Symmetry: C2
Subunit: 499 residues, 2 copies
């Protein structure tokens, strides 16, 4: 088996599977959505079993659409939505409850307490992260706290913990392998990214038994093989794992220190390669592991913009102002205003570089002359503004001048938005040839593990330069646009009603 | 180890796979639509490959929803839309062009020429059918006439003909088995339903090389085994095949002469079992093979109503009066009129017992008070009216009485309509517990072939019995409503197109 590699990308609202040849071309792909659950305001959950089914469906779909046999797959790469947490019974394999998604805030009481108990610096020094409900640590605690006899069962070695990648590999191997990779582990807030080990102090602190934790490994090595009856008779090698944003960094071939990217999906995530040394200030940002390969660990600086695509999804199902997501492209392209309406989509608090979990969504500059087209254009522009907030924060934290910026993700399909993005940044923006650089990065990792590709230089030559965007906006126009934004965000932060 | 049998129903607009257990309980299912192509008006085509992919999709989706493993499948039953034709290269395994659907009128000129040259009584004698673009025979002639190199490649033995059941089995077995069952064969208009063999006179008459033809076997027996890479990982016995309407007859357990059923889907087909011998006149109706099992062959009497659910689909996609097909029911219920409006949806001509290809869709009795609810309602009742036309024709023809009519199919969801059907027919109407009796029949034929079930008696055991519908409409109202219909249809037939 060795002519194609398969990549699985389990996302926030959908799953996808793509089969690639030794040249990096999509021979076929499938994509399927799965249910989102909002039990209380701010709470966001997923049914781990429904995610597994969305995954079985897209793996099948890609085989069908491509017409190739499973016994022809050299290896499988897995990339997933990070932080999302699942806890399940190792004997029945059944989740003890719904999975808590990275977007959820249901574990805020727990994260707030950790700050009050003064663990902020300790956590950051060990994990490179900031205490918040966003990471896995507090989600496991929430589950052990609110599920009948779960903590007691946990103390007995019956319950397992895992991010989506561990959940998937566990399923693919029918309970034989319980593993995860450096990047996913570093996003848990329970993993020391310097010593490269689960941190006992933080585990004791949260009363989480270490018997729940999976083995941590590199992003490119054979973790195991699919159970024959779990992959159509064939035992295919699972050889690549990485959080979707890290997988995207790799897929953009940003291997050199300093190279930076931005992926536009449910959220926007700006990631920069910092090399084998996280040696620099990371004030107002996160320090995580980009990837571990060839016996080495590469670090990264990241800025999280939680609401990007999910805002357009909001204009569709919330305000019902838009009919379909792609229609926002056309509506914003008909705005006759002068850009003074600002939308700050902090539905679940402001992300990097603000990290203000109290703030909520807000809109400024409204006048009777403001149309639906203006409101929609302002919603789309928000992700472009916060991206600059992050990039400019990154330049300060490293000095590293940024002359270029690679971008990818579905929301990058918008030519106008990409031009706006480059105009306010005042730097070049290069869009990937094919938007799915995440599934591509997962495939590279698996490929290198099974020798599908000789090494990094071979992937480089396999590049494919894509659409380039250049600044063309007057210096006075972007200065004002951004200044207005800064004031809108400042205004949004002054509103902290607490009933 | 087994305990389950799968049934694949490849329909007109979508495909579905269902996994059943010893008790006939639906354990898992999956449905998926595939593209419909309308090149020129009246034409309807499918890409056989996309049909193939839709089948793989629902097969996978059925396992996934059930958690059942493929190696636990005792057998596979297959049913399909019945006349749709596909011709392909036996070597490359590729179709020479899109499949022509049963709905398509593109082969009409060919059929008209045959009735002109006076071949009607002959085809009818031999096949039990009427000459029409509806059946496979003229569709194959069409493809050979219009596809470059086809006739030569077929004369040279490179091309194969097949209805959807034959196409799928060829796929599941990766070109190892080219076969079809009695029920599907009888519908090609190239099969002699009396001598049970492909008719040499009709073939030579349509210039169709016999080498294109599949072997014709019974509806219940092991045709072969899937190739592991063709069936979600393993080798499973393909043990049942039947046209969708005959499989529905079998799933309603209409095993005896006189037992009749109606299936409401894209079209509506009324089928009555006639036994081991036709033995009767079939004026205005079709005589076909119901199915072959236990070394015997059972015939059926069929009345075809081409447009039923597709009319509702037209209101949603054509005129756009409704947002979603289920909305039609809500609207019809709200109708405030007095039932004086008639819709005769003969989009491609009138079916049984009229068989008038020159007729087109018509509407009668409009007034300025006629509302959308009135119009939607009239469209829905149309199937009930023509169904009564057919039942009355079967009665006149057979002499057999019809106290009970079994019904199934998607459009059988509508209680208000089944009640209307009962009121008009003045007969009881028993709806099936599982409206998907087509997939159930297919599973039965396969179960029996592999021993999943021992005989027909064990099947009649697990009979559930759905909701019953009894007449509760005054005699005078029924006779008026139906009288208006006959006059609406009479007026529709006076307007001849081409």
């Amino acid at each position: 088996e060795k002519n194609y590699v398969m990549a699985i990308d389990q996302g926030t609202t959908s799953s996808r599977a793509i089969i690639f040849d030794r040249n990096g071309k999509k021979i076929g792909s499938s994509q399927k959505e799965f249910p989102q659950y909002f039990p209380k305001s701010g709470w966001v959950e997923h049914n781990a079993n429904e995610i597994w089914n969305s995954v079985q469906s897209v793996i099948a779909g890609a085989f069908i659409e491509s017409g190739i046999r499973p016994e022809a797959i050299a290896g499988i790469g897995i990339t997933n939505q990070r932080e999302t947490t699942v806890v399940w019974d190792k004997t029945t394999g059944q989740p003890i409850a719904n999975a808590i998604v990275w977007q959820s805030r249901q574990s805020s009481p727990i994260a707030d307490q950790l700050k009050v108990d003064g663990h902020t610096e300790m956590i950051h020094e060990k994990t490179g992260l900031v205490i918040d409900a966003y990471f896995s640590a507090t989600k496991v605690r929430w589950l052990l706290d609110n599920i009948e006899g779960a903590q007691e069962k946990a103390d007995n070695g019956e319950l397992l913990f895992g991010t989506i990648d561990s959940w998937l590999v566990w399923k693919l191997t029918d309970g034989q392998v319980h593993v995860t990779d450096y990047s996913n582990a570093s996003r848990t807030m329970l993993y020391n990214i310097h010593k490269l080990e689960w941190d006992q102090e933080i585990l004791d602190l949260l009363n989480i038994p270490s018997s729940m934790l999976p083995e941590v490994k590199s992003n490119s090595e054979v973790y195991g093989h699919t159970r024959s009856y779990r992959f159509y008779g064939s035992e295919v090698p699972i050889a690549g794992m990485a959080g979707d944003q890290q997988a995207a960094l790799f897929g953009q071939m940003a291997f050199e220190k300093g190279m930076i990217k931005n992926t536009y999906g449910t959220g926007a995530f700006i990631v920069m390669n910092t090399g084998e040394e996280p040696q620099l200030s990371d004030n107002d940002l996160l320090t995580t592991i980009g990837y571990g390969i060839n016996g080495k660990v590469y670090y990264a600086l990241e800025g999280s913009i939680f609401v990007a695509g999910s805002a357009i999804q909001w204009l569709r199902d919330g305000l019902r102002m838009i009919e379909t997501s792609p229609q926002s492209e056309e509506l914003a392209a008909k705005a006759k205003g002068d850009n003074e309406v600002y939308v700050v989509p902090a539905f679940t608090g402001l992300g990097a570089p603000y990290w203000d979990s109290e703030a909520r969504g807000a809109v400024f500059g409204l006048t009777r002359g403001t149309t639906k087209e203006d409101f929609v254009r302002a919603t789309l522009q928000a992700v472009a503004y916060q991206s600059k907030d992050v990039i400019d924060t990154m330049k300060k934290d490293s000095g590293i001048d940024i002359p270029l910026l690679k971008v990818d993700g579905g929301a990058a399909k918008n030519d106008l938005l990409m031009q706006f993005q480059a105009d306010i940044l005042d730097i070049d923006v290069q869009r990937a040839a094919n938007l799915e650089t995440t599934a591509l990065g997962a495939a590279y990792l698996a490929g290198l593990a099974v020798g599908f590709w000789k090494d990094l230089d071979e992937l480089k030559s396999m590049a494919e330069e894509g659409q380039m965007f250049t600044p063309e906006m007057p210096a006075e126009e972007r200065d004002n646009l951004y200044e207005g934004w800064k004031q809108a965000v400042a205004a949004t932060q002054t509103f902290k009603f607490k009933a």
